[PDB]
Design an enzyme around this catalytic site. Structure first.
Site, PDB file in Angstrom:
ATOM      1  N   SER A   1       3.859  -0.750  -3.413  1.00 53.54           N
ATOM      2  CA  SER A   1       4.417  -0.421  -4.714  1.00 53.54           C
ATOM      3  C   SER A   1       3.312   0.167  -5.574  1.00 53.54           C
ATOM      4  CB  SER A   1       5.017  -1.649  -5.386  1.00 53.54           C
ATOM      5  OG  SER A   1       5.507  -1.340  -6.675  1.00 53.54           O
ATOM      6  N   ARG A   2       3.545   1.363  -6.112  1.00 55.10           N
ATOM      7  CA  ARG A   2       2.536   1.998  -6.949  1.00 55.10           C
ATOM      8  C   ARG A   2       2.366   1.251  -8.263  1.00 55.10           C
ATOM      9  NH1 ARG A   2       0.964   7.073  -5.620  1.00 55.10           N
ATOM     10  NH2 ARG A   2       1.349   7.519  -3.409  1.00 55.10           N
ATOM     11  N   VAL A   3       3.477   0.922  -8.922  1.00 51.98           N
ATOM     12  CA  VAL A   3       3.406   0.192 -10.183  1.00 51.98           C
ATOM     13  C   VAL A   3       2.616  -1.094  -9.999  1.00 51.98           C
ATOM     14  CG1 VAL A   3       4.749  -0.689 -12.095  1.00 51.98           C
ATOM     15  CG2 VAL A   3       5.637   1.171 -10.730  1.00 51.98           C
TER      16      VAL A   3
ATOM     17  N   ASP B   1       7.911   6.134  -5.596  1.00 53.57           N
ATOM     18  CA  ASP B   1       6.667   5.442  -5.887  1.00 53.57           C
ATOM     19  C   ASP B   1       6.220   4.634  -4.678  1.00 53.57           C
ATOM     20  OD1 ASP B   1       7.122   6.487  -8.459  1.00 53.57           O
ATOM     21  OD2 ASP B   1       8.274   4.711  -9.012  1.00 53.57           O
TER      22      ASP B   1
END
Ligand SMILES: Nc1ncnc2c1ncn2[C@@H]1O[C@H](COP(=O)(O)OP(=O)(O)OP(=O)(O)O)[C@@H](O)[C@H]1O
Ligand SMILES: [Mg+2]
Lengths: 36, 469, 513, 90, 109
Positions: free
Chosen positions: C372-374, C347
């Protein structure tokens, strides 16, 4: 084609001149101080 | 089951047959596996042996294990039954919603449309976005390249395209995830069924989903793109409607093909890619076109490795792209949330011949006006405002209004932003921008041309503002 | 042609003789050639791919190449023991490793054998090393934080449970340090008993000398953070196949927790080294080499692994398995083969720079590249707000840093931004083996974004941090307790904080300007 | 062409471009002061313009060198791969 | 020239297209038909979907059609849409043949 060498030579040369003068001053000042 | 597994090398599998051999590209099925294991024939080694690529993990296989020849390439169920359903590369349902209802099963591999059934005189695909239909028109049945970071505007823009194509046009959409992160797949599937793009109730969900997970071996990530393409071809030929094929970054499709070639023992090409890069890529890109019955317009994500446009994969790809849509982070910061950049975005279909002279002039004028403002911004950062002439200040005001105008509300994001979406049409879009260049709105305030559909809406708001004081 | 390895003179001689005796060809094999830890075995039919086989001496092997006339096996041990002519019997079972709770607090080999010597391992059952990752349905959105304890990470690069975050950087930049710091922070829950937060940690060592592993274990025992962590060791002396299996063995141990509703964190150290071991096995098997001599399916090797870290839905139990793979870039170039693969798989990536490490920035985290994708979805309600402003300020400061050396010459309101950014970077610094609770992080990041640090001298930022936390921890304990329980920074607490911080700065002995 | 040397030369030009950009900022500030005070300003104006031109020229060269570095990188990958394949064939 | 009949100046035109999109060639023919310039033009199409040997061979087929006019006293103009595509197709066939690749992985020949 070498620009990095140009900067390195420039840096070295200017530092040497400035700090050579400083060394002259430092020897004179400490000598004046050591004599008394 | 007249075949046996002679040797197993990782994903590659060689099958010893008896009598007639499966024609190349056919799909073989192994017997006794816990899960359905399909083998795609790659070549005929000789001595009644064939070499194939496994679609799933070959763990636990045994030499001498029986293999069945389906007699045709991978056949996937196509039709409206796939709508709202997550499909695998071999057509299995992975959404736990039961078996798929299919009208027919089409082969993944087929010849592209002939030269006769090709459509000439390419025409615009009216998506409904002002900026796209103005500066970077989408050619109907043409490949489109979307350059966008993680979460800039990508997913919302994709959903808006699907919904707008469903409403204004009668067509569906197809999302093919080539080697996508499984976590992102769940977020997308759940992101839908919340925006109502797909539902469990039949007659709805004008979008199908094909997913090839990264954890799948090569051969699955390589053919999953063709699977989604085939689902769309049914709608094009039988239904006769326009289809929209989204492809998770095509670079992963290209990368998977490179891996199977290496496994097969083919000598790699220039920078490690397979020799068949052009052909492997051209196959998919050619089956995507406009015909007499319908069209398949593809919007595909582009990842540039090492930021090298001259890399073989993006280069051979750009050879096909008709338009490019570049999403910019700065636009998001400014509060405009179509991230597309007017200048960086380009369309090969934008010329005075394909489109009217007035449309071309308006787009060029808009680009020139925006470009001039960019140069002045670098100036004022150093000098200031007073240094500018009156014409420069007028240009700044005009350019800011246009830039703010390029933004528009989307139906999918109305619940979030609380403002309903607008499906701006082509004609009114061009007329609005032409009038704006004349200076019809220079008197009104800048904050008026924000999230407004058509010029009339912004003008009415400006007159109302004047009334307040 | 040239020849076939299955056409050995001894095997051919039997055919010419005419005696059809194969000494139970099925389930038994005879070695034909041995070299570089790879043994080719004639016969041994009915052997599954990836199955364990026993040699005459006792060492095991893995059948990786099932060819027409032979089987290419990788020996799991020293190649000197077995010689040509030896017999090979298939164990009849795929490679599996023991799992359970009784393993936490023990150092294991790649196959589950305890090497720490503390005694015999008593566990209930065993799990297969190679299995498929969860689908799309069993999963669930990543909504729960995995507090590493690092201020920069928890604020700017949040890690949610079930997420795949890549710790990438050059050699000796502080990668293993971040992993160990994470493990230490997770110890408060076990000591307190907050089952909801308990996160079992798993450390996988690949291509590392045993000396550093012993030091690593001593640190964990010193800080008591052992007894809830598992160390899987595939040292440099271990054969290549072991270095290739260790990550999968560890991932299976973590899946145990994930399936049962427990939360587990797995760290793969020197993951890049695992690729090197796989490359060796592949090249010795004469498989077609690709870029940098890596096999074609190297990517696959990692995907099927990392994709097993997931956040299972509440129906299965709600468990999760968070991964933290490590990658060593040679010249800080992520354009290499293995970095690009693992970046495309994961991610987000924590990118560590060596120049920053020199400049005294520890951890040497480059927030520009780190992503960070999240994102905010992982952070607690209190952080998200201030973290956004923090990210913006750092972005502007990095843009302006190009003019740092020209400070007085530039106009005001710009040199001020430069001064502010320095305070923040100094605040983000942190010592090794000093993880911070999330509540304390909020207070410090709050003091920084509000601008109170602009008064102090940069050299005093860290002293204020430690000293101010001690005062807040001592006096304002209800304030921290609320931030910890509620998980959000209420308006009242914001005002309370905003009033005492400047007051503390004044009464504090540290100078200001 | 010895990518290591190219990257060094690329790094040097970036520092030159960065330093030249900073001096243009400083020259604008100092030129403003003199015009407020008002030849000295003329010196500053020429310096600001010259640094802008120099940073512009450096940027062009840096982009051009980046192309060559990518070109050299692709060739290096290709050349090494061919060695490996030739060794594996026999 | 074809309209007026000044044979000495008129020259037929051949348009080979290697690795070009099928839709592009279709639109090209339409434009040529619109201007009534197709009566003396020839098109040899080997699109991207076509196999590599076809791309490798098309230019030679077109050149032969032109040699007809050359040898019969007439004048012909042959165009080769990108030859770089032909080289890629030939490189593909060669690499698949196990031949040694040169710089940029192109065969020596
Ligand atoms: N926050 C920190 N503050 C001060 N020093 C640190 C910090 N983190 C790490 N160091 C030191 O930097 C060095 C690297 O530590 P560490 O082994 O954890 O990183 P590494 O990149 O994994 O090293 P290796 O390449 O050998 O695996 C060590 O000398 C460590 O003591
Ligand atoms: Mg380390």
């Amino acid at each position: 084609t070498r620009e990095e060498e140009w900067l390195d030579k420039r840096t070295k040369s200017q530092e040497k001149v400035y700090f050579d003068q400083e060394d002259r001053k430092a020897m004179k000042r400490l000598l004046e101080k050591l004599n008394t | 089951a007249n075949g046996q597994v002679s040797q197993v090398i990782g994903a590659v599998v060689d099958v010893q047959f008896e009598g007639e051999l499966p024609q190349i590209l056919n799909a073989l099925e192994v017997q006794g596996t816990q899960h359905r294991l399909v083998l795609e024939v790659a070549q005929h080694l000789g001595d009644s042996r064939v070499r194939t690529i496994a679609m799933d993990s070959t763990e636990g296989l045994v030499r001498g294990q029986p293999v069945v020849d389906t007699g045709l390439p991978i056949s996937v169920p196509v039709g409206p039954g796939t709508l709202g359903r997550i499909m695998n590369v071999i057509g299995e349902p992975i959404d736990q919603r039961g078996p798929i209802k299919a009208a027919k099963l089409y082969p993944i591999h087929r010849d592209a449309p002939s030269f006769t059934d090709q459509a000439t005189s390419a025409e615009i695909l009216v998506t409904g976005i002002k900026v796209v239909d103005l500066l970077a028109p989408y050619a109907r049945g043409g490949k489109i390249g979307l350059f966008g970071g993680a979460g800039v505007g990508k997913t919302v823009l994709i959903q808006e395209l699907i919904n707008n194509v469903a409403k204004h046009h009668g067509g569906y959409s197809v999302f093919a995830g080539v080697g996508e992160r499984t976590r992102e797949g769940n977020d997308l599937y759940h992101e839908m069924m919340d925006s109502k793009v797909i539902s469990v109730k039949e007659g709805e969900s004008r979008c199908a989903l094909i997913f090839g997970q990264m954890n799948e071996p090569p051969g699955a990530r390589a053919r999953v793109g063709l699977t989604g393409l085939t689902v769309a071809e049914y709608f094009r030929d039988e239904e006769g409607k326009d289809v929209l094929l989204f492809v998770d970054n095509i670079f992963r499709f290209t990368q998977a093909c490179s891996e199977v070639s290496a496994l097969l023992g083919r000598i790699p090409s220039a920078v490690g890619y397979q020799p068949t890069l052009a052909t492997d890529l051209g196959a998919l890109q050619e089956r995507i076109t406009t015909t007499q019955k319908g069209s398949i317009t593809s919007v595909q994500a582009i990842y540039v490795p090492a930021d090298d446009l001259t890399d073989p994969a993006p280069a051979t790809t750009f050879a096909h792209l008709d338009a490019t849509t570049v999403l910019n982070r700065g636009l998001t910061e400014l509060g405009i949330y179509p991230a597309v950049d007017p200048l960086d975005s380009t369309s090969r279909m934008l010329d005075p011949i394909t489109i009217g002279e007035e449309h071309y002039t308006v787009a060029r004028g808009v680009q020139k006006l925006l470009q001039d403002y960019k140069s002045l911004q670098d100036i004022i950062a150093i000098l200031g405002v007073d240094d500018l002439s009156e014409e420069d200040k007028l240009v700044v005001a005009r350019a800011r209004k246009v830039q703010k105008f390029l933004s528009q509300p989307f139906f999918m994001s109305e619940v979030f932003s609380g403002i309903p979406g607008r499906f701006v049409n082509l004609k009114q879009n061009i007329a609005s921008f032409k009038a704006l260049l004349e200076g019809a709105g220079d008197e009104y305030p800048e904050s008026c041309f924000y999230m407004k559909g058509d010029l009339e809406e912004s003008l009415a708001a400006g007159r109302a503002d004047a009334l307040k004081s | 042609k040239k020849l076939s390895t299955g056409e050995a003179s001894v095997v051919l001689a039997e055919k010419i003789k005419g005696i059809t005796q194969q000494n139970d060809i099925t389930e038994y094999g005879t070695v034909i050639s041995i070299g570089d830890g790879i043994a080719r075995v004639f016969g041994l039919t009915k052997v599954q791919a990836g199955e364990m086989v026993e040699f005459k001496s006792g060492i095991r092997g893995m059948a990786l190449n099932l060819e027409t006339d032979n089987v290419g096996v990788v020996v799991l041990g020293n190649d000197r023991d077995i010689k040509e002519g030896d017999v090979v019997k298939r164990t009849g079972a795929i490679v599996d490793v023991p799992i359970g709770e009784a393993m936490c607090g023990r150092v294991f080999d790649a196959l589950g054998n305890p090497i720490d010597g503390l005694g015999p391992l008593k566990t209930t059952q065993r799990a297969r090393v190679e299995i498929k990752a969860p689908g799309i349905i069993p999963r669930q959105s990543v909504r729960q934080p995995m507090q590493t304890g690092i201020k920069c990470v928890d604020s700017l690069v949040p890690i949610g449970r079930g997420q795949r975050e890549l710790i990438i950087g050059d050699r000796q930049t502080g990668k293993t340090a971040i992993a160990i710091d994470t493990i230490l922070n997770q110890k408060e829950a076990f000591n307190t008993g907050d089952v909801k937060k308990q996160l079992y940690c798993i450390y996988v060592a690949v291509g590392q000398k045993r000396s550093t592993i012993a030091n690593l274990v001593s640190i964990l025992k010193q800080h008591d953070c052992m007894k809830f962590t598992i160390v899987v060791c595939a040292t440099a002396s271990d054969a290549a196949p072991l270095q290739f299996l260790a990550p999968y063995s560890g991932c299976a141990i973590g899946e145990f927790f994930r399936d049962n509703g427990k939360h587990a964190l797995i760290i793969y150290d020197d993951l890049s080294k695992q690729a090197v071991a796989y490359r060796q096995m592949s090249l010795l098997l004469r498989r077609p080499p690709g870029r940098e001599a890596y096999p074609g399916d190297v990517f696959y090797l990692h995907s099927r692994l990392l994709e097993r870290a997931a956040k299972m839905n509440d129906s299965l139990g709600g468990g999760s398995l968070t991964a933290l793979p490590v990658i060593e870039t040679q010249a800080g170039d992520v354009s290499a083969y293995i970095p690009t693969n693992v970046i495309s798989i994961t991610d987000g990536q924590i990118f560590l720079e060596t120049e920053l490490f020199y400049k005294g920035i520890r951890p040497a985290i480059n927030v520009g590249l780190s992503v960070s994708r999240v994102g905010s979805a992982a952070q607690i309600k209190a952080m998200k707000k201030i973290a956004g402003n923090l990210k913006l300020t750092l972005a502007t400061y990095r843009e302006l840093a190009a003019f740092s050396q020209f400070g007085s010459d530039l106009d005001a309101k710009t040199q001020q931004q430069l001064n502010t950014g320095e305070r923040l970077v100094e605040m983000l610094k942190q010592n090794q083996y000093t993880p911070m609770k999330v509540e304390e992080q909020v207070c410090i990041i709050f003091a920084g974004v509000k601008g109170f640090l602009d008064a102090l001298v940069t050299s005093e930022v860290l002293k204020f941090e430690k000293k101010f936390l001690e005062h807040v921890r001592t006096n304002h304990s209800a304030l921290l307790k609320r931030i910890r329980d509620s998980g959000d920074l209420s308006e009242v607490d914001t005002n309370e904080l905003n009033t005492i911080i400047p007051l503390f700065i004044q009464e504090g002995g540290f100078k200001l300007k | 062409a010895n990518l290591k040397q190219l990257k060094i030369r690329m790094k040097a030009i970036g520092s030159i471009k960065k330093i030249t950009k900073a001096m243009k900022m400083v020259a604008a500030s100092k030129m403003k002061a003199e015009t407020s005070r008002l030849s000295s300003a003329s010196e500053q104006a020429s310096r600001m313009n010259a640094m802008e031109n120099a940073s512009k020229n450096a940027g062009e060269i840096l982009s051009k060198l980046t192309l060559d570095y990518n070109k050299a990188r692709q060739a290096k990958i290709t050349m090494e791969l061919i060695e490996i394949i030739s060794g594996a064939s026999i």
